[PDB]
Amino acid sequence: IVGEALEYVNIGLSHFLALPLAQRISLIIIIPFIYNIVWQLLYSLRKDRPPLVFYWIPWVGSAVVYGMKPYEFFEECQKKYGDIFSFVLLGRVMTVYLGPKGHEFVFNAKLADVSAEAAYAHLTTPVFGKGVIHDCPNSRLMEQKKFVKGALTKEAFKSYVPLIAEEVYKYFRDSKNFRLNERTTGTIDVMVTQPEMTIFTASRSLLGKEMRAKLDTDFAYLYSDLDKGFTPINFVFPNLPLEHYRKRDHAQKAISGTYMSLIKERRKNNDIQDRDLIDSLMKNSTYKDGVKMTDQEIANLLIGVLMGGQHTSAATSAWILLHLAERPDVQQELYEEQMRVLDGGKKELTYDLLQEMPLLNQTIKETLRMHHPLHSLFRKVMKDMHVPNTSYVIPAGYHVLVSPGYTHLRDEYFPNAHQFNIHRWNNDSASSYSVGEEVDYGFGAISKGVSSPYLPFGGGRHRCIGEHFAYCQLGVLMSIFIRTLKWHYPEGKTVPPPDFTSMVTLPTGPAKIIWEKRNPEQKIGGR
Ligand code: HEM
Ligand SMILES: C[C@@H](c1ncncc1F)[C@](O)(Cn1cncn1)c1ccc(F)cc1F
Ligand SMILES: OC[C@H]1O[C@@H](O)[C@H](O)[C@@H](O)[C@@H]1O
């Protein structure tokens, strides 16, 4: 008889419940910790799963090392396990596929296999608002990208360039950080100046003069508050009863209400032209099933596009200034190109002359190689996926992670990858280009293959549509900085390390450079 063993099981359960509170709590942490380690050992035997990085603290996983030094985390994992490995991250299992085969696996994954929106909806919907980007089916997103891409034409860039130039010169004249009419040298924190210059130039060109005008008021404080809600904490705490979350929600309503006010005003007066992205979305925002975007969804889409382009672009111009501050040779080279292309400054900068400035564009390209703003791109796995040429199966409910920025820093693909060298792009200054066949997901033909080791703008259905706007904006900014200023580091200082815990891989603050006017007697006119 072993029914006596079943009696003692019941007896033991009854004695378990009688344990004093110090031991029941002690067991409350001892039991999961022990079972978590037991489970990892058994998992390591599965031949149809990638290796899983070992971790001590249940639920948390490798969150700390990944959050603070992700590329160092990937490099060590890659040496132990190779290019495919999983790790636990705050309750999720992330499967990483490093290198160009991983770009192909994740960026070209089938629509039914993976979902970006299920990975990101909690990050962006609380900031942007409902009904756009990740708060909608993929076919809706594909068409929103088509709508936005319709204000981003060559002829739009031709009119944006003088407007962006005006904003940069205004900033040089009026900002406390410069005041070029009264100061000939000064010190700036580039993580103060670049977010400001970026919002001013992106507002004037994409949003128009009215929304730019609002940035000269206390309304600008709403942008700061909404900006602060764009943070990785939303992956864990998207809504908490705190002032941070309520200033964010207030800003989203106030800002989108301001966009809707302008929109309803324009169509009240039939004042709908071809000036900015607001006009474009007012004329071209009907989905292919006949449904029109509402004014709320148009406003939420403007917020999302401006907020993403704000963070990637401002981080990138910060890094450009920081790399050039220790490279007066590159500043000199760029300056000579400006004098040649613009006939000593007697030519006005135009979008077409921007295309004749290869070294300037290679500097943006090289900065995006060394500082990809988004160190990791996620998808949630919706159907079990077989990893080709392996026995691995990534089950549904995992997440896949692709990191083109990690491959950007591999000597195998970019010799001396940790050295900033714009000439590695000689005869190849295009922001990107399809090396062969093309495909259309809804917003234009893009490269069909995504195995290039350089992918600053991603690829596949979720590929960036802001690339040409970003180059135009960054090119005008840097053209004007180069012609107007020389700059260098305070003594002893150098390029700062990246801060990987924020939404983009921005420089660790404070990152100060000292500027000096090239022409101390140059005056910037206007009121
Ligand atoms: C240096 C500047 C930029 C970089 C490096 C960059 C990079 C990227 C990358 C890597 C993706 C792919 C995301 C993924 O696969 O999960 C992406 C998507 C996207 N980006 Fe950008 N971007 C930049 C600027 C901009 C600008 C200026 C805009 C808007 C004008 C913009 C709008 C978008 C949009 C709408 C998507 C589509 C997201 C999706 O389909 O899921 N980006 N970008
Ligand atoms: C989802 C978000 C993101 N994805 C991954 N890691 C960090 C991130 F912030 C992002 O891809 C960033 N981004 C890309 N180009 C500009 N911004 C994004 C895309 C479209 C958008 F309308 C707004 C937006 F924030
Ligand atoms: O001239 C083409 C124009 O297309 C419109 O839809 C956009 O609003 C403008 O940004 C662009 O300049």
- The span from the CA of 304 to the CA of 255, in Å, is 12
102 phi, psi to nearest 5 deg: -70, -35
Contacts of residue 134, Cβ cutoff 8 Å, sequence gap at least 6: 116, 117, 120, 121, 123, 124, 125, 141
- The span from the CA of 39 to the CA of 317, in Å, is 46
Measure Cα distances from 237 to 126, 131, 231 in Å.
11, 21, 10
Measure Cα distances from 265 to 57, 215, 260 in Å.
55, 19, 8
The answer to whether residue 187 is domain-embedded is yes
The answer to whether residue 95 is domain-embedded is no
Closest by Cα among 299, 310, 287, 345 to 479: 345
The answer to whether residue 89 is domain-embedded is no
The answer to whether residue 188 is domain-embedded is yes
Ligand 1, atom 16, lies closest to the CA of 377
The answer to whether residue 360 is domain-embedded is yes
The tokens describing 32, both together, are 């999961």
Q: 226 exposed, middle or buried (CB, 10 Å; 0-12, 13-18, 19+)?
A: buried
The answer to whether residue 6 is domain-embedded is no
Q: Which residue of 303, 374, 457 sits with most ligand 2 atoms within 8 Å of its CB, as the best mutation to test the pocket? A: 374
> Which atom of ligand 2 is nearest the CA belonging to 378?
5
DSSP string of 201-221?
A: HHIIIII-HHHHHHTTSTTHH
> Which atom of ligand 3 is nearest the CA belonging to 206?
10
203 near 212, Cβ under 8 Å?
Answer: yes
- The span from the CA of 522 to the CA of 527, in Å, is 16
225 near 250, Cβ under 8 Å?
Answer: yes
Contacts of residue 169, Cβ cutoff 8 Å, sequence gap at least 6: 480, 524
Residue with tokens 């305070």: 490
Residue with tokens 């997440």: 399
Closest by Cα among 225, 222, 231 to 122: 231
Q: Which helix (H) or strand (E) holds 307?
A: helix 295-325
Distance of CA 451 to the CA centre of its chain: 20
- The span from the CA of 100 to the CA of 109, in Å, is 13
The tokens describing 84, both together, are 């495919």
Distance of CA 77 to the CA centre of its chain: 24
Strand partners, 402: 377
DSSP state of 188: E
Looking at residue 519, its amino acid is N
Closest by Cα among 69, 56, 232, 380 to 77: 69
- Domain of 479: which CATH number? 1.10.630.10
Q: How many domains does the chain have?
A: 1
DSSP string of 246-266?
A: HHHHHHHHHHHHHHHHHHHHH
Residue with tokens 């350089």: 454
- In angstroms, this model's resolution equals 2.0
Q: How many CA atoms lie within 13 A of 2 on its CB side?
A: 0
Q: Which residues line ligand 3 (CB under 6 A)?
A: 150-151, 153, 155-156, 159, 274, 276, 279-280
Contacts of residue 51, Cβ cutoff 8 Å, sequence gap at least 6: 44, 80, 81, 82, 84, 85, 86
The answer to whether residue 49 is domain-embedded is no
Q: 118 exposed, middle or buried (CB, 10 Å; 0-12, 13-18, 19+)?
A: middle
In three-state secondary structure terms, 278 is helix
The tokens describing 208, both together, are 């128009």
Q: In what order do the strands lie in the sheet with 399-402?
A: 84-89, 92-97, 399-402, 377-381, 114-115
The answer to whether residue 382 is domain-embedded is yes
Looking at residue 42, its amino acid is L
- The span from the CA of 53 to the CA of 136, in Å, is 34
> Which atom of ligand 1 is nearest the CA belonging to 315?
1
What angle do helix axes 295-325 and 467-484 make, rounded to 10 degrees?
A: 40
Q: Per residue in 394-429, is it b (16+ CB within 10 Å) or e — as a string?
A: beeebbbbbbbbbbbbeeeebeebeebbbebbeeeb
Residue with tokens 């966009």: 259
- The span from the CA of 248 to the CA of 45, in Å, is 46
What is the whole-number distance in angstroms between the Cα of residue 80 and the centre of ligand 1? 32
What is the whole-number distance in angstroms between the Cα of residue 308 and the centre of ligand 2? 5
Residue with tokens 């978590």: 36
What is the whole-number distance in angstroms between the Cα of residue 437 and the centre of ligand 1? 22
Q: Which residues line ligand 2 (CB under 6 A)?
A: 120, 124, 133, 304-305, 307-309, 312, 374, 377, 464, 466, 503
In three-state secondary structure terms, 500 is coil
Residue 487 lies in domain? 123-517
The tokens describing 484, both together, are 């107007």
Measure Cα distances from 59 to 4, 36, 37, 81 in Å.
38, 9, 12, 22
What is the whole-number distance in angstroms between the Cα of residue 505 and the centre of ligand 1? 14
525 near 166, Cβ under 8 Å?
Answer: no
- The span from the CA of 7 to the CA of 14, in Å, is 11
- The span from the CA of 110 to the CA of 460, in Å, is 10
Q: Which residues line ligand 1 (CB under 6 A)?
A: 116, 141, 145, 305, 308-309, 312-313, 316, 368, 373-374, 377, 456-458, 462-466, 469-470
Q: Residue 348's CB: how many other CB atoms inside 10 A?
A: 10
87 phi, psi to nearest 5 deg: -155, 155
From the CA of 125, the nearest ligand is: 2
